[PDB]
Amino acid sequence: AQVAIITASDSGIGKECALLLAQQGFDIGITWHSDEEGAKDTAREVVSHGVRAEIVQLDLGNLPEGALALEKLIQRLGRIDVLVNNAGAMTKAPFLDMAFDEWRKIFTVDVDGAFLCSQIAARQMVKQGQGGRIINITSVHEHTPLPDASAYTAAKHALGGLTKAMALELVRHKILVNAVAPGAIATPPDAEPSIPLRRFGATHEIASLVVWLCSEGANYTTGQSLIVDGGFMLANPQFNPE
Amino acid sequence: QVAIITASDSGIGKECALLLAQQGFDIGITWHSDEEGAKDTAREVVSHGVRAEIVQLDLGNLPEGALALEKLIQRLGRIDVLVNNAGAMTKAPFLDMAFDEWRKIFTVDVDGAFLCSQIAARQMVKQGQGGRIINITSVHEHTPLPDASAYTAAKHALGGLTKAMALELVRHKILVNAVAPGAIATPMAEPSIPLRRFGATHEIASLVVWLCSEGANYTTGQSLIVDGGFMLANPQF
């Protein structure tokens, strides 16, 4: 089979990517930071689709050595064709008060892990000589700021820039690199008038685009940030309800 | 369900019609050029067990020419998907371009999509079941050509209309996006492009199909660029 690895997987977007790719016949790897039972839970659901599931701890508290877990996971699965760098929870902190270690921790978890995992995956894809795909889950805040989450905004921008740089630098290896940039996604209702579509997105509505990016139809798409946001990016003071 | 491709061609238009026919959409086609290509596409659509209906929609006769889309919607019974396909690129140096040439490029490249989108959106509102409008633009929605100022300006216009329709039609659950191709190989190495080849028509049509899927229900107001890395390239590349 092709092999897809979802890094920093969670019960939301990351789990939904794992399951939809398992249903497409990919063997799946999962990395986890602290939530081993959630990773084991997803792995059991993946195995129910008749593909392989392998998990490993990738400790974002112990970079860069901690990232060598992905090498071991690739060795166990035999190859890698797809890396999906899933986004962790949003950490907020007021700009004026934010401790330097909190600024650094948000970059460590939200960019540095994706950097190290992307480099390991890309080195394996070059070794195989069969191309590959790297898909970074970012946010609308790759593009437009939060008013109370400056580190989170800056790190999403950083992962956007890394996405473009990897796309250009790795294109020669036929490694396609893109971001999927979610808006406000419900992780299980009243209308949400602040969003043009007037609801939160579903995890499936992000994972579906990841699946398309893993299809042969996506073979001309690289260097892009594909925004799935219910119109969040269209909102401005002439729309925003008072 | 019904998908209509306006200003269809033997490239992206045909491949959208065929992939949507295979998802079980009845197909409408309008043509401004290559009627025989539209008829060939309709014959191949019918081989997939769905309906194919075609009309001329003459972009040299706007606005009255656009009423052909009302006739096509009447014949197919409804519309769920509109794909506004893009015509050929016309180049013309800026300093000496005739005003009529400038206006003709806006007529063909945005006025047609405007009128088709209004007719489709009215029908989708009447149905009450939402809909999808997909505008085929260009990388030149975003970045210029050095010798095609009218084409560039009209692609940008269609990108702005995409955003405006997306926001204005959103409470009717009509999702509006652009697919922005780079250099595509059509019936009608490239070291300059990072992937070092032209795109295939199926690599545009594939994304149009995804935008017609339930998985795309949260996607609106966007311009999805399918360009082999064209947008990444600069004088440092």
Place this chain on the structure above:
Amino acid sequence: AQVAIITASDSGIGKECALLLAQQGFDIGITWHSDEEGAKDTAREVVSHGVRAEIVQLDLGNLPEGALALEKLIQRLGRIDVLVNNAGAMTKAPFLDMAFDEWRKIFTVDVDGAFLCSQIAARQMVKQGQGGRIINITSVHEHTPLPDASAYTAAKHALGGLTKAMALELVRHKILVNAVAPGAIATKPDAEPSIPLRRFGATHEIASLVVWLCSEGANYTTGQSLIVDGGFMLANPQFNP
């Protein structure tokens, strides 16, 4: 003296660009599509700064022939160094109901005028061989939509595209082409909580940037859309007034 021409001038941004450029030593041309008396008042104020002012009518209801008034104005000023294509009033019309003639009229007034004026100015700049500047007044709606003004949004996008295309195509002539994209401008503090800076902009706050774009300091700037908007573009659904 260098010459700056402000096309489709008004008592707002266009007037303030004329007055601030007169104060930087530019002879001024003004074209008017509306408000003839305002154009004459601007001219009288410009001449107080010790430079020339010339005005013509340029009727956007008579394109293309009406644009030839700009050739007469350039002749009368002897040269052109700067063209400022000023933006007219925004027209709102619902998308589903909009008449096709309404759609086309917005493109005529908001893109086609700037196209023909830019061609005439660029031809003269090329013949002079001394470079030039074309500055298009667009809008934040070059970039983000209105909810009820699809034609205005599309036409501002079009003028943004034309800005980039002219910048690339005219670069060998050292003709620098940019857009200044205003937000909500008064034509005050804490009166507008929907905007992050909590007020409308002043005409001076647009014209000041136009003045900078006409300075030698701006000689490396081309192809850009410089947004002056009190943070309008930042006001996503998570902005709290």
Place this chain on the structure above:
Amino acid sequence: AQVAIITASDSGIGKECALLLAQQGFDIGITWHSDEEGAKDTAREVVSHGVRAEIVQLDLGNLPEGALALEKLIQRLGRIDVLVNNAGAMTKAPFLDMAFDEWRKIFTVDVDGAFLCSQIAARQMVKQGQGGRIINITSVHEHTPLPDASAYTAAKHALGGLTKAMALELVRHKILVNAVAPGAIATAEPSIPLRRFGATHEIASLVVWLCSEGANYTTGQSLIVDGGFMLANPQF
């Protein structure tokens, strides 16, 4: 006088910002991470304009403690009205071979410094209650990649995001936050549409404009000064 401080100053854009703001009558603070002699040359030229010049080392190899040099510089000048976070040199490393230490060094020098300096300046501006300006010198690579400088590209994007976040978060204090994004600056070229490198004064001139009252409605933007670099696609 109003006070402008140039952080991570150099003999190019940083010096020219200091000189052109001194001409407008700003007292000047200079921090240096490299080229101490250049910071002293800048100060010498600044005082010719009849304003104060104060210099400190701000060591980006010693963060976060090193950033407290900016608190000392503000104390010496009495206030701050303008912070210009100047950009250091571009560092390249191939993506597949890049060490984690190289990635981290580039984020330390190209983002973390600007973050800590911006926080210190913004706190002072809030304490004063008189508004202020923060101007980040980024790059065209805030927007478009290098093909062989992925860390530099990511870090410039990061600083672009921080610029937007600070613009929105600090707006109630009337602290205006923008980036100036240079192309290729000299400190004929047929790869660049205008066929030359930019001059340091063609960047500093825009920074001076952003420090004027006419710029009082500009916040959250990245103003690209690049000779058309961004327009040059595979069709140029």
